[PDB]
Amino acid sequence: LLEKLKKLEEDYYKLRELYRRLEDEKKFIESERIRYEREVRRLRSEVERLRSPPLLVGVVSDILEDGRVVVKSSTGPKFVVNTSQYINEEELKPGARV
Amino acid sequence: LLEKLKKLEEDYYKLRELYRRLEDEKKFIESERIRYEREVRRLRSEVERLRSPPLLVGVVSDILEDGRVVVKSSTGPKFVVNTSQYINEEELKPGARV
């Protein structure tokens, strides 16, 4: 009765004060998440401007081992351009169109 | 008394529960926050590499005594271009890819 309720009321009081603090801290963390989630879409869109037209046919010419790829363009030049993790030199071999 | 204790015990349990349900929901968000951060930085780095304008391939077909370098381009026309300060013209001779 007097003893029984009192112990349960005490427990609930101390825990609430802990949980209120933790709730407040995570409320700020949520702002940052929306900031970062939006920045991700923005950046992915920069990748897609390349992936969208105009597109031009090239055929891998050869591969440098400093992580660059030489491609002979159908336009004319052999030119050297740097690679990505989106598409790797392990998915390119000379004579394959890209 | 006993009645008083009941009202107080109820309020502290209900608020305890409120803060903890919110706490977990935002723990999900916290995970997301770290996950999209990594995706910004890695997206950003790679977008720089592709976007890059290339460096064209040419071959020193001949080389001049006037400090100038006779470079047959892979565009098609011939050009006579200036050797940098950084590369020497002892490192440049017929058949030197540039």
Swiss-Prot record, chains A, B:
Transmembrane segments: none annotated. Consists of three main regions, an N-terminal coiled-coil domain that may assist in substrate recognition, an interdomain involved in PAN hexamerization, and a C-terminal ATPase domain of the AAA type. Homohexamer. The hexameric complex has a two-ring architecture resembling a top hat that caps the 20S proteasome core at one or both ends. Upon ATP-binding, the C-terminus of PAN interacts with the alpha-rings of the proteasome core by binding to the intersubunit pockets. It comes from the Archaea. ATPase which is responsible for recognizing, binding, unfolding and translocation of substrate proteins into the archaeal 20S proteasome core particle. Is essential for opening the gate of the 20S proteasome via an interaction with its C-terminus, thereby allowing substrate entry and access to the site of proteolysis. Thus, the C-termini of the proteasomal ATPase function like a 'key in a lock' to induce gate opening and therefore regulate proteolysis. This is Proteasome-activating nucleotidase. Belongs to the AAA ATPase family. It is found in: Cytoplasm. Residues 1-52 form a coiled coil.
